[PDB]
């Protein structure tokens, strides 16, 4: 399948310690990524994708939008 561009967050976890998360980016849905996403950035430097199916999601709809 001729690979078009993809979402940065194709898969996610609900499982993360909030103590670790220094920051939080949210980006809308777009033509280059159908689902919206949010990128939690940790203390050590990594970034992670967190689930919008979980009730980490009601702090999105309101948040950016």
């Amino acid at each position: 399948e001729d690979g078009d561009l993809q979402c940065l967050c194709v898969k996610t976890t609900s499982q993360v310690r909030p103590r670790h998360i220094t920051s939080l980016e949210v980006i809308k849905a777009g033509p280059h990524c159908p689902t919206a996403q949010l990128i939690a950035t940790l203390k050590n430097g990594r970034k992670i994708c967190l689930d919008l199916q979980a009730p980490l999601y009601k702090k999105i709809i309101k948040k950016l939008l």
Partner: antibody
Amino acid sequence: EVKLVESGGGLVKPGGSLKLSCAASGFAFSRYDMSWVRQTPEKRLEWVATITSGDNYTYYPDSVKGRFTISRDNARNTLYLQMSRLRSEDTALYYCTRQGLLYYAMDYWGQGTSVNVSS
Amino acid sequence: DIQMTQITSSLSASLGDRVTISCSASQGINNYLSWYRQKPDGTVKLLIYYTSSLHSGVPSRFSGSGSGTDYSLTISNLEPEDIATYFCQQFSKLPYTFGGGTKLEIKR
């Protein structure tokens, strides 16, 4: 209600011009991606245009590139579709729509302003 | 371009029935499908987004499903407000393409 009134639709002669308008009401218009879709007389639906709410880009399909020109005015809460060099095929009912937020489908559509196009 | 194929132009179903309305896709979309309903006259309104998540103000009898290239909308106990045409869109990639539409009519 989220509401989308549309206007400017009418009869135009082939190779002509027309500017459709779509008045928005019931949401933060500036922070929403907006689009235009049309319904052929044949009946089928057809994507026409989209515009990024971070002011940025416009996206059109091959069938109308360069002829059509989507544009917004966040001050007015109004979305324009600037049509020119019209054709037989462009005869259709033109809906303005709202993309956006979590999953990027068109969640709200207007009544629909009509564009009959003949000589 | 993704050819979105809604195989049954129209389909017959008596009132109070269970209706399945299939929409197949030329290539894999990532359950980024939609469903729309157009009242014979009225505007169209978003029914389901993603593949199965229902839009606000949509009855509970509407339930989407599917994965890959095949998808279905399905309406338990059909009500006369639902005699209409139904459309599937995909939004996985540009250009956004719709289905041919399925008209719903009542069997006699």
